[PDB]
């Protein structure tokens, strides 16, 4: 409603770095809000695509940002009559970023890893890795829970049970308010998908450089399965956290699995011990229900609500024809201990191949009426196919079925405007929360400031 679509702020990075693939707000130790931006195809030292992370200070004019430096050299350790190898070429550093307190977490979901023992090997595979930084202090640390030193032959004997070689940890990420980092790994357990949790503080105290394989005892990984419903389900494609069991001392996890049960797609809500509390199944196959998940209380009852994006849902139209437009589902948490029922609201895109619901960002309370609001991305929507971001406002009964404001892409065709979103933070300190939009196709990030209501 009250986002300013006239005077935008533009940040930008190198040509072809996919600057804007992922973004989040970052408050330093003094509370000064900055923007951290992931550019997963930034060139490294060897002039090879490695990805990179930028930390953008708030300036109404915008412009270029300084890099948040990480080590980009491949590592090798000859220990225990084995050889450990990390390969950072095309690792995609910055494919997801997230901030918590004065710490930044950026991940390289396609960092490869292999172990050599004489003639055998573990196989060179993308375990993924996340990098952690405290920009003010210069502290650095890594976390790579799916690295292993088990050889290829062993996995064959046990029928590839507990195979963490292709996790792609850091594909999606989130941090609980208590400081527990949660990594989605859609390739873990032979593309069933897994989650990895570990306190940030214990990631720093247990990391030393050059070790490559180290223990983090306070960590917790989800579990393999023999159920074919979970096969190739990419469990961990998207992740979020919320409060869904009534116990405020426990934090619950929300996980998207958009190819669950033979591309039906599903979203599950779990406790911190990965025990299943509810499961929302997809409405239509290959709709990618679960591509994106968002948690926020939209109807002002103190109970977090769930939003799920199916950017490929095909809407039924006249003459028995179908049109891929995308769809967003709203689930209102009921009073006390009860299951989340049918969707309270169905939001369906309009533009063909617009992928309405590819990204869903909690905005906070935008118009300051007492109900939290959201933004929904249609990165190839709008009449021109350039991309659109749609705002929907909260209300006592959920959300308004029609948008209050529509943000047309100020970038050229193919920018993927809206592919990444983040709101609910006041960056210019004017009392109203603001929105940042990513267009990695144009290598830029647009900042929309919220103004008093007209």
């Amino acid at each position, epitope marked *: 409603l009250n986002l300013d679509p006239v005077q935008l702020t533009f940040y930008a990075g190198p040509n072809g770095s996919q600057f804007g693939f992922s973004l989040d707000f970052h408050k330093d130790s003094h509370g000064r809000v900055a923007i951290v931006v992931g550019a997963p195809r930034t060139l490294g030292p060897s002039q090879e695509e490695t990805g990179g992370v930028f930390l953008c200070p708030w300036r109404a004019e915008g412009g270029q940002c300084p890099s948040l430096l990480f080590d980009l050299r491949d590592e090798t*350790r000859n220990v*225990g*009559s084995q050889t450990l190898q990390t390969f950072k070429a095309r690792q995609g550093l910055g494919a997801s970023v997230v901030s918590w307190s004065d710490v930044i977490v950026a991940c390289a979901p396609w960092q490869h890893w292999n172990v050599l023992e004489k003639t055998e090997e573990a196989e060179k595979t993308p375990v993924g890795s996340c990098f952690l930084a405290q920009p003010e202090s210069g502290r650095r640390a890594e976390y790579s829970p799916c690295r292993g030193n088990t050889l290829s032959r062993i996995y064959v004997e046990n029928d590839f049970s507990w195979d963490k070689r292709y996790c792609e940890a850091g594909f999606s990420s989130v941090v609980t308010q208590a400081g527990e980092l949660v990594l989605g790994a859609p390739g873990g357990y032979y593309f069933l998908g897994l989650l990895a949790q570990a306190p940030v503080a214990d990631i720093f105290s247990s990391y*030393r450089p*050059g070790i490559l*394989l*180290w*223990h983090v005892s306070s960590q917790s990984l989800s579990f393999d399965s023999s159920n074919p419903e979970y096969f190739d389900g990419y469990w961990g494609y998207s992740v979020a956290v919320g409060e869904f069991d009534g116990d405020l001392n426990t934090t619950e996890y929300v996980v998207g699995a958009p190819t669950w049960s033979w591309t039906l797609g599903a979203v599950e809500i779990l406790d911190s011990y990965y025990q299943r509390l509810h499961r929302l199944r997809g409405e239509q196959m290959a709709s990618y229900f679960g591509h994106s998940v968002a948690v926020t209380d939209v109807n002002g009852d103190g109970r977090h609500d769930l939003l799920v994006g199916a950017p490929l849902y095909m809407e039924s139209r006249a003459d028995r024809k179908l049109a891929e437009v995308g769809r967003v589902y709203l689930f209102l948490q009921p009073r006390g201990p009860h299951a989340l029922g049918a969707p309270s609201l169905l939001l369906t895109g309009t533009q063909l191949y617009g992928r309405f619901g590819s990204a869903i960002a909690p905005l906070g309370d935008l118009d300051r009426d007492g109900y939290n609001d959201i933004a929904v991305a249609a990165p190839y929507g709008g009449p021109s196919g350039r991309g659109q971001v749609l705002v929907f406002l909260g209300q006592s009964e959920g959300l308004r079925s029609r948008p209050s404001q529509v943000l047309d892409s100020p970038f050229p065709t193919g920018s993927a405007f809206g592919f990444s979103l983040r709101g609910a933070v006041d960056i210019d300190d004017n009392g109203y929360p603001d929105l940042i939009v990513g267009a990695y196709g144009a290598n830029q990030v647009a900042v929309y400031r919220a103004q008093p209501v007209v």
Partner: antibody
Amino acid sequence: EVQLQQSGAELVKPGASVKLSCTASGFNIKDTYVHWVKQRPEQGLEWIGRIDPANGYTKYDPKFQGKATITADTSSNTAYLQLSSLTSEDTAVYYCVRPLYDYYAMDYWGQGTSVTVSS
Amino acid sequence: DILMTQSPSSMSVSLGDTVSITCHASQGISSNIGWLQQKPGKSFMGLIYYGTNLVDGVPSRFSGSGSGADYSLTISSLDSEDFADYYCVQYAQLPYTFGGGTKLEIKR
């Protein structure tokens, strides 16, 4: 806290067998590797072998192949070291070891089990 | 197997002295070495791993250094508890192998 509580001192005859235990306290035995080390005053410290209690796979110094046998039961959270056809040279103190962070290190140690072989 | 030559076998020193134990390997091990402490009639406590990193809880007066096939353990300002046996251990290759041991004795 991490603590390795080993079995009590044993007093056996040559040719017989003994089975020392190493019970985990304040952590799951399944987490890391578990090594066994032999200590004598003259010969000093010698590495027996290791086990990964998550899967049971083991490695041994060729010198102990035959006498040492390392096992692990995650249920009782204990790791075991079996010795067979004992000899006066097997009279030593035996420690179980695990690493802190580094997968391959030797940082946490048990109190040690005292073994005496004599007729 | 890799032979770990630890020197000296023993040394007589006093409180507050700054002493250095060394450990020489038959080949390179690229800092894959640890340092241990066994107080008289007791068990072992981890001091260093990966050549330089301190085990949690150990004081900062201990410090490891070195590279290739020559490493060192240094204690700045000895304490009354530091008089004990010290061993090095390599884990670059299997089987792991230890050093002969070094005992710190009170001088008089």
